[PDB]
Structures are given as structure tokens and as C-alpha cells.
Design a protein around this ligand. Structure first.
Ligand code: SF4
Ligand code: SF4
Ligand code: FES
Ligand SMILES: [Mg+2]
Lengths: 230, 56
């Protein structure tokens, strides 16, 4: 019908108009690295981890936000894509705190795993790190904002899914901080979900703190009975 | 060793070789049990540039 033909590493794919590069990549089983993109949230495009090279194009594009075009050949594993990933990971890790042994995210961290799979294995950052003050948003979500990478997933979830506009960014530049700018509890019937969407240990569960590691746990898939939603 | 020279001669005649030259027991030629600290060089991937992981 209206399907257009693109190429992922030379493999032809038929996609609907408006499909992004990331979704076209997903169709053939290739997952593009991401930090700010969530498939149930608005497209942000700020983390820049999803940069990929289009054949015969000099500038890499943000796969999460760029619609595909007819005849495009997406090169997911080229030198340009890998160098972009390494540079973005280096910038992400320059100011990140050395907190993994005391961070509850350790073992199920997207930052850790994508650094292992797409980043470099060492550092050349020879400066001091930034440190930001912590915020209190209630007894449910523990907050350690030095680990924040400014993906704005929590803000987008709060505005779009929960309907609460209490979260935002204050300042600018390297000093931009995610928070409420005042002492205010982010209290919602769906607030705890921002623990799951947060890719790092910036937001964690307070009742769960320090009790377990992800590789220890045994998972049982079952149903909730606290209401009739199931 | 502390053996008297007559016992040394008896040992060397019985074994057929000069035993005092190569003794089983080590006396003072081994290294000191306290050593200076090392320095331990780094390696070939410790450069500051031209060191992208995709090339290695
Ligand atoms: S958020 Fe991830 S990378 Fe950062 S300290 Fe915690 S486990 Fe380590
Ligand atoms: S707190 Fe977590 S989800 Fe929110 S912007 Fe920072 S890293 Fe992203
Ligand atoms: S995932 Fe595309 S810029 Fe963040
Ligand atoms: Mg988290």
C-alpha cells in the first residue's frame, strides 16, 4: 500500500510512513542504544546515545526522532556509529559518581550495561566531578541526584502519564538540575513508576534500599489483587 | 654448613663430588624478606588520544 522500502545494513525492510530509524532497526531485531527514548513517552532526543550513520550522509542522525526515508541504508555497526556511541558514553561518564558498590541500580543498570557493550573501557577525564544536593519528594522514591544523567524521563512521565506537572529542570548548562525547585512531595497513585523508568540509580525505591542485588533474585510472574484491574 | 673439615672430606669421598659447593640448605644468598616498593608500568592502551576501543 503506502509502505516504503528502507535498508538496515543492506537488508530491505518495508515500513509505514512516519516510522523512525530506531523502529526500522527494531523490525530486523537490532536494538539501538538509548537513554532518553521511551516508547510510551514523548520523543525527547537529548541523550544522543542513539546516533547512527546513514549511508552517503555526512551527519549522524538521532535514530529515536528521525523518520526514515525511501532508499535509506541505516548503518548500525559502522565506524561512525561506534565512535559516536563511545563519545556520548564518555561524556555521560565524565561527571557520573563512582557509586556502583553503594548504588541500588548496580547489576541492572542501563548505564553500566551500555558502557560495557558500546563504550570505552577506560577514562581520560582528569578533572573534578560535579556534586548536586539531594531532593525530598516523599517517603516512596529515594533521590540521589548526583547520579542523574538528565534524560528527563521522569518529567515526561509525570506530565504525560500521571498528569502532574511538579517536575522540571532548573538552571542551565552543566548546572541544570531535575527537581521541583521547592520542597514538595511528588505524590501520585502512579509515582513509583518513575523508579522503573529512571535508567540509573538517581531514583530508587526507598523500602527496597540496600536489601538485594538483581542477580540474586528469583522472579515469579503472577497477578495483582489490590484492585480489580488485574 | 658448620661441618668440620674431616666430615667434609668424608662426605665428598662418599658421594664422589664436592658437596660444599652446592648445598641443599640455603643460608644467606636468598633475597631479603623486605623489598623496596615496585613501580609496575601500565600497558599499550594507556594513551590519551588515538585510542578508540573499536580499533582494539
Ligand atoms: S547508576 Fe549505574 S553506573 Fe551509576 S553508580 Fe549506580 S550502578 Fe553505577
Ligand atoms: S532522575 Fe532519572 S529519569 Fe529523571 S532525568 Fe534524571 S536520570 Fe532521567
Ligand atoms: S535515545 Fe535518541 S537522543 Fe536519546
Ligand atoms: Mg532507577
Amino acid at each position: 500500500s503506502n509502505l516504503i522500502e528502507v535498508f538496515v545494513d543492506g537488508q530491505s525492510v518495508m515500513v509505514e510512513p512516519g516510522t523512525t530509524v530506531l523502529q526500522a532497526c527494531e523490525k530486523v531485531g537490532m536494538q539501538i542504544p538509548r537513554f532518553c527514548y521511551h516508547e510510551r513517552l514523548s520523543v525527547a532526543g537529548n541523550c544522543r546515545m542513539c546516533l547512527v550513520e546513514i549511508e552517503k550522509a555526512p551527519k549522524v542522525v538521532a535514530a529515536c526522532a528521525m523518520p526514515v526515508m525511501k532508499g535509506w541504508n541505516i548503518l548500525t555497526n559502522s565506524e561512525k556509529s561506534k565512535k559516536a556511541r563511545e563519545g556520548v558514553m564518555e561524556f555521560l561518564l565524565a561527571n557520573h559518581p563512582l557509586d556502583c558498590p553503594i548504588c541500588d541500580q548496580g547489576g541492572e543498570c542501563d548505564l553500566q550495561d551500555q558502557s560495557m557493550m558500546f563504550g570505552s573501557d577506560r577514562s581520560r577525564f582528569l578533572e573534578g566531578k560535579r556534586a548536586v544536593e539531594d531532593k525530598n519528594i516523599g517517603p516512596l522514591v529515594k533521590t540521589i541526584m548526583t547520579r542523574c544523567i538528565q534524560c528527563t524521563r521522569c518529567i515526561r512521565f509525570a506530565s504525560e502519564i500521571a498528569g502532574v506537572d511538579d517536575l522540571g529542570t532548573t538552571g542551565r548548562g552543566n548546572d541544570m538540575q531535575v527537581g521541583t525547585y521547592i520542597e514538595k512531595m511528588f505524590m501520585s497513585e502512579l509515582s513509583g513508576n518513575i523508579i522503573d523508568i529512571c535508567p540509573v540509580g538517581a531514583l530508587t525505591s526507598k523500602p527496597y534500599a540496600f536489601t538485594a542485588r538483581p542477580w540474586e533474585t528469583r522472579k515469579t510472574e503472577s497477578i495483582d489483587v489490590m484492585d480489580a484491574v488485574g | 654448613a658448620s661441618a668440620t673439615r674431616v666430615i667434609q672430606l668424608l662426605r665428598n669421598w662418599a658421594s664422589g663430588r664436592d658437596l660444599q659447593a652446592k648445598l641443599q640448605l640455603r643460608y644467606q644468598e636468598i633475597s631479603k624478606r623486605t623489598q623496596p616498593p615496585p613501580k609496575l608500568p601500565v600497558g599499550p592502551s594507556h594513551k590519551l588520544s588515538n585510542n578508540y576501543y573499536c580499533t582494539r
